[PDB]
Amino acid sequence: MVEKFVGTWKIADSHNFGEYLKAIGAPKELSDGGDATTPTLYISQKDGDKMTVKIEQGPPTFLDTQVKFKLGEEFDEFPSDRRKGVKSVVNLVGEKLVYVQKWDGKETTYVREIKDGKLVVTLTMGDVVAVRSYRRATE
Numbered sequence: 562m563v564e565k566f567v568g569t570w571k572i573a574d575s576h577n578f579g580e581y582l583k584a585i586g587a588p589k590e591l592s593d594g595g596d597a598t599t600p601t602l603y604i605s606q607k608d609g610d611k612m613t614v615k616i617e618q619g620p621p622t623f624l625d626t627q628v629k630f631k632l633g634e635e636f637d638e639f640p641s642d643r644r645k646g647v648k649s650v651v652n653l654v655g656e657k658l659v660y661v662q663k664w665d666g667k668e669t670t671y672v673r674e675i676k677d678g679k680l681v682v683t684l685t686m687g688d689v690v691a692v693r694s695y696r697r698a699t700e
């Protein structure tokens with residue numbers, strides 16, 4: 562099932578990402594800089610219940626990091642927005658993968674789904690809804 566997100570990826574199109582970043586208390590520096598980025602994912606997994614992901618973002622932020630999670634298990638995360646006390650948790654929702662961030666008494670969400678070959682992640686904080694679209698490294 563999750564063998565559909567697995568692979569190599571690359572930014573293609575984004576919209577309303579900086580303002581999202583603001584909704585989640587990021588300084589302008591990081592809202593702009595973060596939107597400015599063209600991140601290159603490297604996604605894979607083991608036993609359809611433990612997904613290992615990577616991110617080579619790039620200029621201007623230079624924050625290359627990694628995810629390593631079990632699906633159904635809450636874990637700790639330290640994003641680039643500099644959030645103290647992020648508690649993630651990722652689920653499988655039909656053909657979609659739902660990544661949820663808890664912090665300071667709030668919840669933001671990432672509904673990722675493959676479509677027309679692209680890894681399309683919709684991002685939801687309050688009334689603010691962002692969208693980005695990735696393509697495989699011409700796989």
Ligand SMILES: C=CC1=C(C)/C(=C/c2[nH]c(Cc3[nH]c(/C=C4\NC(=O)C(C)=C4C=C)c(C)c3CCC(=O)O)c(CCC(=O)O)c2C)NC1=O
Nearest residue numbers: 582591592595598614616618622624628640641642673682
């Ligand atoms: C389902 C597989 C999958 C997973 C698990 C995934 C996770 C994922 N996607 C991103 C990129 C990444 N980077 C940022 C934001 C930034 N980028 C910058 O250089 C800066 C400074 C900021 C902050 C202002 C966000 C919001 C995301 C996640 C959204 C996305 O690109 O999908 C990160 C690191 C972001 C950070 O530094 O906080 C992670 C863990 N992406 C996928 O496709």
